[PDB]
């Protein structure tokens, strides 16, 4: 069996890989940040509660001007909010109600939502006719779309339940690059700040590092036990945090190529649905199935705060580009905005 | 507020009104979930009531239904079965002909045991369709049902066999008191299908009318 010899070659190659990662693990992040001063208790309170959805809110995304946010719920609506005024500037009825993701364009021109329809439909907001209309339907994924993220007005990287990620061209509607290698189905995705690369996560309990310019996986990160629901880069673009069903958020370096640290408590047993950082990345927020967001000191592993406003599972949260406020959405059909 | 911010508040108020109207239209309709293994007669069911998730509208006795054939997508269902939390009923199509075909009936029991005891469906009633019963009416006598079911005491023709398959499906739920299972052996040319769906949704509608009325 020649493929058995190939599998032994693969086995000694992964053994050499974890030897190479183990050879550079001279210290932990925890003993480096043992000296640094803790930030204490972050007493965040709800500034605004956004109340217009009638079903479970599955996704949310902040605009780049830190005022408009889109939220997609299962009542067939994605609503774009004015977060300062709690005003709805756009209610968009969806083609399929079963939405699981939403995005906001960095230019602010488009939103893009997708779900069980296998289509990350793209909606033009700055139209001459004044209504929001579908601009492009992106079919081609054979599994449910879990996360789609905008690079530009013309490129969008989508994650789906067919174990592949795809980079699209919005004018053609044809996916230009396919990102294969995940064996389980990909649930989470986050772009780097320079957007030359991104990371994704699946039921392999693995995170993979894909480049949008060439199109292959350069790095694979392992250390979770189950599916990761959540991923978000550090604002430097050199690290990211992954939330899973293991009640463990884990941070990984790109350039050091291993897991650094685990954000776990004994009193948390439910899964993490969303993660995000702050502007500086000192603290990472994390939504839980225990209905509350947990603010973790991303350097000292301590629970710096608890945001317990929601009556159901916190499915989506995000932090503005200004870093002013954190919006958290949840399955009791409310967005709460914390500061 | 200035003039433009007051008009933005007014635009948001009309958007609130349309959201309330559309959620009130979708609150008074019935959302059903087709299931079952492959080629189990589900497509014949959705033909006789009338890429991604397939949706079917039909109004029966002034009651708007929305059927959801979600089975066209092949992914691990634990990551999207909570989207259908809060459906009224779960239409489950089991082929009686797939007892001898290949452990396909055992695959149907695997999927029924998975979703009948699912944590998001601890309350939702399940309509269970046993179709291809005429195909069962020939293939009872060509090959016995003991090749599918390991014990099967007392084999006969079509009556204790169908009742045994009924009883072997019905006890799979570990909580028989919170939820309730409906069953219908059905033909291909009959109006008992959508009639039974109406009369099994009506119990759930009564229970939801009492949940809305604090009871």
């Amino acid at each position, epitope marked *: 069996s020649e493929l058995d010899q190939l599998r032994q070659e693969a086995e000694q190659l992964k053994n050499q890989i974890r030897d190479a990662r183990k050879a550079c693990a001279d210290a932990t992040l925890s003993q480096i940040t043992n000296n640094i001063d803790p930030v204490g208790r972050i007493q965040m309170r709800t500034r605004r509660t956004l109340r217009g959805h009638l079903a479970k809110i599955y996704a949310m995304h902040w605009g780049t001007d830190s*005022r*408009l946010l889109v939220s997609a719920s299962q009542d067939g609506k994605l609503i774009i909010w*004015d977060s300062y*005024t709690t*005003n709805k*500037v*756009h209610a968009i009825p969806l083609r399929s109600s079963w939405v699981m993701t939403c995005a906001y364009a960095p230019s*602010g021109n488009y939103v893009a939502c997708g779900g069980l329809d296998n289509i990350c439909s793209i909606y033009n907001l*700055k139209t*001459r*006719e*004044g*209504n929001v209309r579908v601009s492009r339907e992106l079919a081609g994924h054979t599994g449910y779309l879990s996360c789609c993220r905008f690079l530009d007005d013309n490129q969008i990287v989508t994650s789906s339940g067919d174990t592949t990620c795809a980079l699209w061209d919005i004018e053609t509607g044809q996916q230009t690059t396919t990102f294969t290698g995940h064996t389980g189905d990909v649930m989470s995705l986050s772009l780097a700040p320079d957007t030359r690369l991104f990371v994704s996560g699946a039921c392999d309990a693995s995170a993979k590092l894909w480049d949008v310019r060439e199109g292959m996986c350069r790095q694979t990160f392992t250390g979770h036990e189950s599916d990761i629901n959540a991923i978000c880069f550090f604002p430097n673009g050199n690290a990211f945090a992954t939330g899973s069903d293991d009640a463990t958020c884990r941070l990984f370096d790109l350039r050091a190529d291993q897991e650094l640290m685990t954000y776990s408590h004994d009193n948390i047993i439910c899964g993490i649905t969303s993660v995000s950082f702050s502007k500086s990345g000192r603290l990472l927020l994390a939504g839980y199935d225990d209905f509350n967001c947990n603010v973790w000191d991303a350097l000292k592993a301590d629970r710096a705060g608890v945001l317990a406003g929601h009556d159901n599972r916190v499915s989506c949260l995000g932090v503005t580009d200004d870093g002013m406020a954190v919006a958290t959405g949840s399955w009791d059909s409310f967005l709460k905005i914390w500061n | *507020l*200035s*003039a*433009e*911010d007051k*008009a*933005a508040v*007014e*635009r*948001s*108020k*009309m958007i609130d009104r349309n959201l309330r109207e559309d959620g009130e239209k979708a609150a008074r309709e019935v959302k059903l979930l087709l299931l079952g293994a492959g080629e189990s007669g589900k497509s014949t069911i959705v033909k006789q009531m009338k890429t991604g998730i397939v949706e079917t509208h039909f109004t029966f006795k002034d009651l708007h239904f929305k059927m959801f054939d979600v089975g066209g997508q092949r992914s691990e269902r634990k990551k999207w079965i909570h989207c259908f939390e809060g459906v009224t009923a779960i239409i489950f199509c089991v082929a009686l002909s797939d007892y001898d075909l290949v452990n396909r009936m055992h695959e149907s029991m695997k999927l029924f045991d998975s979703i009948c005891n699912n944590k998001w469906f601890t309350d939702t009633s399940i309509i269970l369709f046993l179709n291809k019963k005429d195909l069962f009416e020939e293939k009872i006598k060509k090959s016995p049902l003991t090749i599918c079911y390991p014990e099967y005491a007392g084999s006969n023709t079509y009556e204790e066999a169908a009742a045994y398959i009924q009883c072997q499906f019905e006890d799979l739920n570990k909580r028989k008191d919170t939820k309730e299972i409906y069953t219908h052996f059905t033909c291909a040319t009959d109006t008992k299908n959508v009639q039974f769906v109406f009369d099994a949704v009506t119990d759930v509608i009564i229970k939801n009318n009492l949940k809305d009325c604090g009871l």
Partner: single-chain antibody
Amino acid sequence: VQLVESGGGLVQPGGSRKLSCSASGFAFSSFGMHWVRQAPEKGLEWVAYISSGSGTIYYADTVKGRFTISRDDPKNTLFLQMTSLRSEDTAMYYCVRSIYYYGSSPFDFWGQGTTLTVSDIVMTQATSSVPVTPGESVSISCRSSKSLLHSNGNTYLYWFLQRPGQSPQLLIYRMSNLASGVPDRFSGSGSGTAFTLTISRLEAEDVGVYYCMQHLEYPLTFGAGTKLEL
């Protein structure tokens, strides 16, 4: 998009007249619509505004009680009902589309205008006519009589260009933001109650009368008009 209007002609004073503007190609139920007239030797003067959904109606003080604005959502038609008219209503009535959410561009589209013949933050244009060199940087200034910088961070000054024989178009909205369909050579800035419109690298077919409009509070008022003449 397109707006067409009708209802002009010779009307006796003291009588009644109904003008009608029908939408074509935009979601007319979602737009708050206005009426702005223009006397044949005088700049623009706002008349009425029925909101989207017909929930909110304002009028100018010179038309309050004599004019009635109402829309029709299925027929996609805005119509204005007048009575007891006089020679001060001898104008050309433009019907203006607008929309109001964050990031919107109100007053972006105007109807083509119909001549009608009958047999308060004041905005001040600093100079009614400036000389034009084609290719020269021209600054057009508007002087308010109130602080248009509202507390929310906005500054509701609007810039319009009425080309000769063509309807006013929105150039710059909220004193700073370019409208869709203007060159980047148009630029406006300023402070509270002090504004300017800088037109660097002036091109041909850009001459006309320029209008500054406040939108801090109703009634909306216009500038007298800054004519650009070669």
